Structures are given as C-alpha cells and as structure tokens.
Amino acid sequence: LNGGITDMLTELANFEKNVSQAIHKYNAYRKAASVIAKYPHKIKSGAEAKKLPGVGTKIAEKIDEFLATGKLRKLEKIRQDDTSSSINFLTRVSGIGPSAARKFVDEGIKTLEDLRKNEDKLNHHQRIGLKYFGDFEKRIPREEMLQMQDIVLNEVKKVDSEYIATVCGSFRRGAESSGDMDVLLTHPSFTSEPKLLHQVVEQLQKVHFITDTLSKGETKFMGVCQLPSKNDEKEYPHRRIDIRLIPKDQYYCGVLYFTGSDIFNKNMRAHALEKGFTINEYTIRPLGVTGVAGEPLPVDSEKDIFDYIQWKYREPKDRSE
DNA sequence: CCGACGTCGCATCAGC
C-alpha cells in the first residue's frame, strides 16, 4: 500500500541512528513509518499523510517528492555515499554501534571481510556478532521457539524445582516467529528487601544449549544458543537469548512488561494513571492526591495488576494493543 | 521557542 514511503522512512531512520547519531530523529522516522504502515489507504499527497500523528512538515515534503518522482534525492545521495553506507552497514554487526562503526570506517575498515582481517580490533561482543552475522538476522519460527522453551524450562526445573521461568516477548503473545528469546527468571529466595543466575546459565552451557556469552552479571545474561542437530539433518541457526533474574515480588511486573506489546503497555500505563496508579517495569504504586507515589503494592500474578486498576485480565494473545 | 523524546545492566573506556 505505502511500502515505498515506509521503506524510504525506515531507510532514513537508519542513517539518522547510525551515521548522524541522532537517536531522536531515528525514533521520529520509525514512528512516522509505523503510523503510515497502519494506514488503510494508499497515500496520495504529503498533506494527507501530515494528518497522522507523527508526520510533520518535513516528511510531508518528502512524501510529495517520492510520489511525484519515485525517489528521494537525499536518500539516493546518502545510499551511494561510500562512507555513510559502510558505517550504516557495520552497525548490523551486534556490538558495533554507530560510534565503533564510524571509527572502523575512519581507518579503512568497511566490510565483514575487513572485520575478519582485523579481529584484534574487536571486543568479545563484536566477535560474536561477527561470527553469527547471518544467523542473527534470521527470524525464529514459533516451532523452534517451542523446542527452545522445552529445553529452557526443563533445565531450569532440573537445577532447582523452585525456580519460575517464563518465555516472554511476542512469542508469549502467540506470534508465529521471534527475533530472539527473552527469558524471565525468579526464585522465592530472591526478593527486593547468591548464584541464582550463574547456576542456570551453567546448566544450559553444560547440556550445550548455550554456546556463547555476550554479557553476564548477577541479574542479566545476554548470549547465544542453538537447538541440537537432528541426526544427519542441517544444523539450526545460532540464536539470541537473554535471561534476567528478577526479585520474586517484582516478577509479575516484569513478565507483564516484557510480554508487551509496547503499544499495549502504553495504554495500560495511561489507564493506570487515571485510576491513580503508577506502573513501571518493576512495581505498581498508588499516587496520592498531590501526585506522590506510595509503597509498591503486593503483586502475586499478572492478574493482580489488572485487578488493582479495574481492568479484565487479557491473555498475552490479545495484548496486541 | 525550545526541551522531551525510556531507562538500565554490563563491558570497557577515561580520568585520577
């Protein structure tokens, strides 16, 4: 419908983030693309688009040029710019952000082939990113996520039967494919007021599900994993997996949040204000008359939170908005 | 006109 326009805007968004280092303009272009992607008519003028929340003057001007000519002069130029297109491209490697990519490109390093010739100039994280460059840009079909979940719930339970683990993200909401796996972990010995994460990571490296580590501390693990290769069949791609340990009395707040979607969370947080509650990723708190937040309220399920705000429990499946 | 635009854990850097 408006694929032309939203690829244009998404492409422009990337140059802002990666080359210009203008994070807010990146987010403006993305938000403009989203609204346009949802617009159920083929757009005829920038004026038509400007009416949508997140489309201003400059993007209207650009939509008009694209409609009249089928291209954007600035984008054509940017796209053919040797420096910018390389900087933009290197940020596709996980761990190479806009600043490292600018440095690489300053000293001549432009391509994966170049990154490969200069491993010693990469931190740990960036090497992993480079190694799994193709695998990381693949999506993960739901089927494989169920298999991955099977493994993670098994090996958690097998470390200590009292752990609670939940695979969140769009997967929890029923999505047909995911970008990564987001695992939220908790245990009744850990509240707000030991080795609980290391032990679980250890078990998953021990049965060869976890294959690499990006980062790991007391509360959050970022790394890589892979389903076991079925007899003589082709090996599965390597996948991104995060695991976070969350205090028991903040866990359901964490699950609700990390399940999303972003839009859904936005609605609920708003609805929660007008009902006198502040909900962050951690806690739900009451708001006194002058706007001052009281003690985090006890939460023992996702549902407890909905109750607090006089809303009816909605399944992850329908938390689309 | 002009500031907000999310916030934070971890790894690694810059400064002392």
Added chain:
DNA sequence: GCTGATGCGA
C-alpha cells in the same frame, strides 16, 4: 586500583 562516563542493546 577505583569511580564515573560512555557505548551498546534491549
């Protein structure tokens, strides 16, 4: 060596 800033991804 320690502490805070910054880059990064989410």
Added chain:
DNA sequence: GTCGG
C-alpha cells in the same frame, strides 16, 4: 523530526 507546554 515531531509534538506540545
């Protein structure tokens, strides 16, 4: 770049 106090 867009919005809104």
